[PDB]
Amino acid sequence: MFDPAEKYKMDHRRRGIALIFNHERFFWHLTLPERRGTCADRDNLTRRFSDLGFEVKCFNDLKAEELLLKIHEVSTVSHADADCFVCVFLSHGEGNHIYAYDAKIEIQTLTGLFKGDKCHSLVGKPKIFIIQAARGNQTNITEVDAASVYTLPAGADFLMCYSVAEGYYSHRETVNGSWYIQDLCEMLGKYGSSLEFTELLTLVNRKVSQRRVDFCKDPSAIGKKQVPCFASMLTKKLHFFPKSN
């Protein structure tokens, strides 16, 4: 009775929550550059996830204490009547860390809040983390960052989506936002409501990888290709078909 086309049950009362932690500026003593264009990423994601039925909650430039407080709140609330959970980090990072305004936080302690034991109401439901984070260097310009955040998985029924893999480069337009987020949001717009979500992330991999880097205004940006990846521990096909209003 094992079914090769089994779908996650996506017929709960609510789609669920999408958190977006948006980080544009950092405490002076961290000496991290501003992420001009991140607000376009935040707004584009808010529209696309909202249109798929998510209750989107955005937070701008939280300090570590506030960020840990919000994400613990969301993890200890009931998801019993929700299909799934989405969490987005738009920041700088290094290895297994993301930067809040004032300090780095271990990604595993954030994903850990939504694992089986700690969040019973999300057991067997998709938990999707999207991470646009790279190394902070030091009218619509393209800024380019080295990959820095480990493309780690997170546990049963987690999907971890990364803007860039080791040895590649992350691009952000200061007005239009991140290449990865622009291409993710275009694909959510056209295909989010019909295509299997990993099939859609594969389109994003193609779109981002096909962006040409041979004729760049800045000569030092030439050859710096971007290739995203995703680490799936999903156990079923994931669709975001339109819900009953």
Ligand X SMILES: Oc1cc(F)ccc1CNc1ncccc1-c1ccccn1
Which of ligand X, its own copies, none does 82 bind, CB closer than 5 to 8 A by kind?
A: none
Q: How far is the CB of 135 from ligand X (least distance, A)?
A: 8
Q: Which of 12, 150, 176, 193 binds its own copies (CB under 8 A)?
A: 150
To which residue do tokens 């952000």 refer?
Answer: 172
* Main-chain phi, psi angles of 163, to 5 degrees: -65, -25
Interacting residues toward ligand X by CB under 6 A: 147-152, 165-166
Of residues 24 and 155, the one with the C-beta less far from ligand X = 155
Cα→Cα distances 241→28, 97, 230, 234, Å: 44, 33, 21, 18
Which of its own copies, ligand X, none does 10 bind, CB closer than 5 to 8 A by kind?
A: none
Q: How far is the CB of 166 from ligand X (least distance, A)?
A: 4
Which of ligand X, its own copies, none does 236 bind, CB closer than 5 to 8 A by kind?
A: its own copies
CA atoms of 179 and 167, how far apart (whole Å): 17
Which 3 state secondary structure label does DSSP give 38?
Answer: helix
Interface segment toward its own copies; rule CB under 8 A; list 45-53, 98-106, 145-153, 174-182: 145-153
Q: How far is the CB of 162 from its own copies (least distance, A)?
A: 8
Query: Binding pattern to its own copies, positions 166-205, x when CB under 8 A?
Result: xxx---------------------xx---xx-xx-xxx-x
Q: How far is the CB of 212 from its own copies (least distance, A)?
A: 14
Give 210: exposed, middle or buried? Use CB within 10 Å, 0-12, 13-18, 19+. Answer: exposed
DSSP conformation letters of 185-203: HHHHHHHTTTS-HHHHHHH
Query: Binding pattern to its own copies, positions 206-245, x when CB under 8 A?
Result: xx-xx--------------x-xxxxxxxxxxx--------
Return the structure tokens found at 200: 């859609």
Q: Which residues are CB-contacts of 178 (< 8 A; sequence separation ≥ 6)? A: 37, 38, 41, 90, 132, 163, 170, 171, 172
Which 3 state secondary structure label does DSSP give 30?
Answer: helix
CA atoms of 202 and 209, how far apart (whole Å): 11
CA atoms of 40 and 179, how far apart (whole Å): 11
Q: How far is the CB of 152 from ligand X (least distance, A)?
A: 4
Q: Bridge-partner residues for 149, per DSSP?
A: 95
| Interface with its own copies in residues 85-114 (CB under 8 A) | 108
**Contacts with its own copies, residue ranges (CB under 8 A):** 2, 4, 6, 108, 150-156, 162, 165-168, 190-191, 195-196, 198-199, 201-203, 205-207, 209-210, 225, 227-237
